[PDB]
Symmetry: none
Subunit: 48 residues, 4 copies
Protein backbone atom coordinates (compact mmCIF):
# COMPACT_ATOMS: atom_id res chain seq x y z
CA UNK A 1 0.00 0.00 0.00
CA UNK A 2 3.16 2.17 -0.24
CA UNK A 3 5.54 2.12 2.79
CA UNK A 4 5.11 5.86 3.57
CA UNK A 5 1.34 5.33 4.08
CA UNK A 6 2.12 2.31 6.27
CA UNK A 7 4.57 4.42 8.39
CA UNK A 8 1.85 7.07 8.82
CA UNK A 9 -0.69 4.52 9.99
CA UNK A 10 1.82 3.05 12.35
CA UNK A 11 2.44 6.43 13.87
CA UNK A 12 -1.14 7.39 14.41
CA UNK A 13 -2.01 4.04 15.87
CA UNK A 14 0.92 4.01 18.24
CA UNK A 15 -0.05 7.40 19.54
CA UNK A 16 -3.56 6.25 20.10
CA UNK A 17 -2.22 3.26 22.01
CA UNK A 18 -0.01 5.35 24.26
CA UNK A 19 -2.96 7.62 24.89
CA UNK A 20 -5.11 4.64 25.87
CA UNK A 21 -2.33 3.41 28.16
CA UNK A 22 -1.81 6.73 29.97
CA UNK A 23 -5.57 6.95 30.41
CA UNK A 24 -5.84 3.36 31.65
CA UNK A 25 -2.79 3.88 33.87
CA UNK A 26 -4.64 6.68 35.67
CA UNK A 27 -8.00 4.91 35.81
CA UNK A 28 -6.39 1.98 37.61
CA UNK A 29 -4.80 4.26 40.21
CA UNK A 30 -8.16 5.97 40.70
CA UNK A 31 -9.84 2.58 41.02
CA UNK A 32 -7.16 1.27 43.39
CA UNK A 33 -7.53 4.42 45.48
CA UNK A 34 -11.32 4.14 45.50
CA UNK A 35 -11.31 0.48 46.53
CA UNK A 36 -8.85 1.36 49.29
CA UNK A 37 -11.24 4.02 50.59
CA UNK A 38 -14.11 1.53 50.70
CA UNK A 39 -12.09 -0.93 52.78
CA UNK A 40 -11.70 1.62 55.58
CA UNK A 41 -15.47 1.97 55.67
CA UNK A 42 -15.94 -1.79 55.80
CA UNK A 43 -13.45 -2.12 58.68
CA UNK A 44 -15.57 0.42 60.62
CA UNK A 45 -18.71 -1.61 59.84
CA UNK A 46 -17.29 -4.73 61.48
CA UNK A 47 -17.15 -2.65 64.72
CA UNK A 48 -20.91 -1.89 64.20
Amino acid sequence: QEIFDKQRRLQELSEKVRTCHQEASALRKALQEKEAEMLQVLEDIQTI
Copy 2:
Protein backbone atom coordinates in the same frame (compact mmCIF):
# COMPACT_ATOMS: atom_id res chain seq x y z
CA UNK B 1 -35.22 -2.16 70.29
CA UNK B 2 -33.58 1.22 70.60
CA UNK B 3 -30.40 -0.70 70.30
CA UNK B 4 -31.54 -2.22 67.04
CA UNK B 5 -32.59 1.12 65.75
CA UNK B 6 -29.22 2.61 66.58
CA UNK B 7 -27.39 -0.20 64.97
CA UNK B 8 -29.54 0.23 61.95
CA UNK B 9 -28.90 3.92 61.77
CA UNK B 10 -25.20 3.46 61.94
CA UNK B 11 -25.21 0.79 59.33
CA UNK B 12 -27.15 3.11 57.16
CA UNK B 13 -24.67 5.94 57.39
CA UNK B 14 -21.77 3.66 56.52
CA UNK B 15 -23.98 2.09 53.85
CA UNK B 16 -24.29 5.49 52.17
CA UNK B 17 -20.50 5.72 52.09
CA UNK B 18 -20.28 2.18 50.71
CA UNK B 19 -22.84 2.99 48.02
CA UNK B 20 -21.00 6.13 46.91
CA UNK B 21 -17.69 4.27 46.71
CA UNK B 22 -19.37 1.44 44.79
CA UNK B 23 -21.13 3.74 42.31
CA UNK B 24 -17.82 5.36 41.40
CA UNK B 25 -15.96 2.05 41.29
CA UNK B 26 -18.75 0.50 39.21
CA UNK B 27 -18.34 3.35 36.74
CA UNK B 28 -14.54 3.39 36.92
CA UNK B 29 -14.56 -0.31 36.01
CA UNK B 30 -16.79 0.31 32.99
CA UNK B 31 -14.47 3.10 31.85
CA UNK B 32 -11.46 0.82 32.36
CA UNK B 33 -13.14 -2.11 30.60
CA UNK B 34 -13.92 -0.05 27.50
CA UNK B 35 -10.55 1.71 27.43
CA UNK B 36 -8.37 -1.41 27.71
CA UNK B 37 -10.31 -2.97 24.83
CA UNK B 38 -9.93 0.20 22.78
CA UNK B 39 -6.20 -0.25 23.30
CA UNK B 40 -6.40 -3.89 22.18
CA UNK B 41 -8.63 -2.77 19.29
CA UNK B 42 -5.83 -0.56 17.98
CA UNK B 43 -3.05 -3.10 18.59
CA UNK B 44 -5.10 -5.44 16.44
CA UNK B 45 -5.20 -2.82 13.70
CA UNK B 46 -1.51 -2.33 13.93
CA UNK B 47 -1.18 -6.03 13.21
CA UNK B 48 -3.40 -5.44 10.12
CA UNK B 49 -0.88 -3.02 8.53
Copy 3:
Protein backbone atom coordinates in the same frame (compact mmCIF):
# COMPACT_ATOMS: atom_id res chain seq x y z
CA UNK C 1 -35.45 -13.62 66.43
CA UNK C 2 -35.16 -10.24 64.77
CA UNK C 3 -31.92 -10.02 66.65
CA UNK C 4 -30.73 -13.33 65.35
CA UNK C 5 -31.50 -12.13 61.91
CA UNK C 6 -29.55 -8.93 62.26
CA UNK C 7 -26.65 -11.02 63.52
CA UNK C 8 -26.77 -13.38 60.57
CA UNK C 9 -26.85 -10.49 58.20
CA UNK C 10 -23.97 -8.91 59.97
CA UNK C 11 -21.98 -12.06 59.62
CA UNK C 12 -22.68 -12.34 55.93
CA UNK C 13 -21.63 -8.73 55.64
CA UNK C 14 -18.31 -9.61 57.28
CA UNK C 15 -17.84 -12.51 54.85
CA UNK C 16 -18.30 -10.32 51.79
CA UNK C 17 -16.13 -7.58 53.31
CA UNK C 18 -13.22 -10.01 53.62
CA UNK C 19 -14.01 -11.37 50.16
CA UNK C 20 -13.80 -7.87 48.72
CA UNK C 21 -10.44 -7.44 50.44
CA UNK C 22 -9.17 -10.61 48.77
CA UNK C 23 -10.40 -9.48 45.35
CA UNK C 24 -8.88 -6.04 45.90
CA UNK C 25 -5.44 -7.41 46.79
CA UNK C 26 -5.86 -9.81 43.87
CA UNK C 27 -6.70 -6.86 41.62
CA UNK C 28 -3.77 -4.84 42.98
CA UNK C 29 -1.35 -7.54 41.82
CA UNK C 30 -3.04 -7.78 38.43
CA UNK C 31 -3.00 -4.03 37.83
CA UNK C 32 0.72 -3.89 38.63
CA UNK C 33 1.26 -6.80 36.24
CA UNK C 34 -0.86 -5.16 33.55
CA UNK C 35 1.12 -1.97 34.12
CA UNK C 36 4.49 -3.58 33.44
CA UNK C 37 3.04 -5.61 30.57
CA UNK C 38 1.77 -2.51 28.78
CA UNK C 39 4.96 -0.57 29.55
CA UNK C 40 6.97 -3.47 28.13
CA UNK C 41 4.86 -3.18 24.99
CA UNK C 42 5.30 0.54 24.80
CA UNK C 43 9.02 0.20 24.91
CA UNK C 44 8.74 -2.10 21.96
CA UNK C 45 6.74 0.47 20.08
Copy 4:
Protein backbone atom coordinates in the same frame (compact mmCIF):
# COMPACT_ATOMS: atom_id res chain seq x y z
CA UNK D 1 12.11 6.09 8.14
CA UNK D 2 11.46 2.28 8.58
CA UNK D 3 11.30 -0.32 5.75
CA UNK D 4 8.42 -2.83 5.27
CA UNK D 5 10.59 -5.65 6.71
CA UNK D 6 11.41 -3.42 9.69
CA UNK D 7 7.61 -3.01 10.17
CA UNK D 8 6.97 -6.79 9.93
CA UNK D 9 9.77 -7.36 12.48
CA UNK D 10 8.25 -4.84 14.92
CA UNK D 11 4.81 -6.36 14.18
CA UNK D 12 5.98 -9.82 15.33
CA UNK D 13 7.62 -8.45 18.45
CA UNK D 14 4.40 -6.76 19.16
CA UNK D 15 2.27 -9.80 18.76
CA UNK D 16 3.90 -11.67 21.63
CA UNK D 17 3.74 -8.62 23.89
CA UNK D 18 0.18 -7.77 22.83
CA UNK D 19 -1.05 -11.31 23.49
CA UNK D 20 0.15 -11.10 27.09
CA UNK D 21 -1.79 -7.85 27.53
CA UNK D 22 -4.87 -9.48 26.01
CA UNK D 23 -4.64 -12.25 28.61
CA UNK D 24 -4.17 -9.88 31.56
CA UNK D 25 -7.12 -7.84 30.31
CA UNK D 26 -9.41 -10.88 30.25
CA UNK D 27 -8.31 -11.65 33.81
CA UNK D 28 -8.98 -8.05 34.85
CA UNK D 29 -12.49 -8.24 33.41
CA UNK D 30 -13.15 -11.38 35.45
CA UNK D 31 -11.98 -9.78 38.71
CA UNK D 32 -13.86 -6.54 38.07
CA UNK D 33 -17.01 -8.53 37.31
CA UNK D 34 -16.49 -10.59 40.47
CA UNK D 35 -15.81 -7.47 42.53
CA UNK D 36 -18.83 -5.70 41.04
CA UNK D 37 -21.25 -8.41 42.16
CA UNK D 38 -19.66 -8.79 45.60
CA UNK D 39 -20.09 -5.08 46.33
CA UNK D 40 -23.66 -5.33 45.06
CA UNK D 41 -24.21 -8.25 47.42
CA UNK D 42 -23.06 -6.10 50.30
CA UNK D 43 -25.37 -3.18 49.56
CA UNK D 44 -28.32 -5.59 49.34
CA UNK D 45 -27.39 -7.04 52.75
CA UNK D 46 -27.04 -3.52 54.19
CA UNK D 47 -30.47 -2.57 52.78
CA UNK D 48 -31.75 -5.94 54.08
CA UNK D 49 -30.78 -5.00 57.67
CA UNK D 50 -32.80 -1.71 57.39
CA UNK D 51 -35.99 -3.78 57.28
CA UNK D 52 -36.45 -5.66 60.58
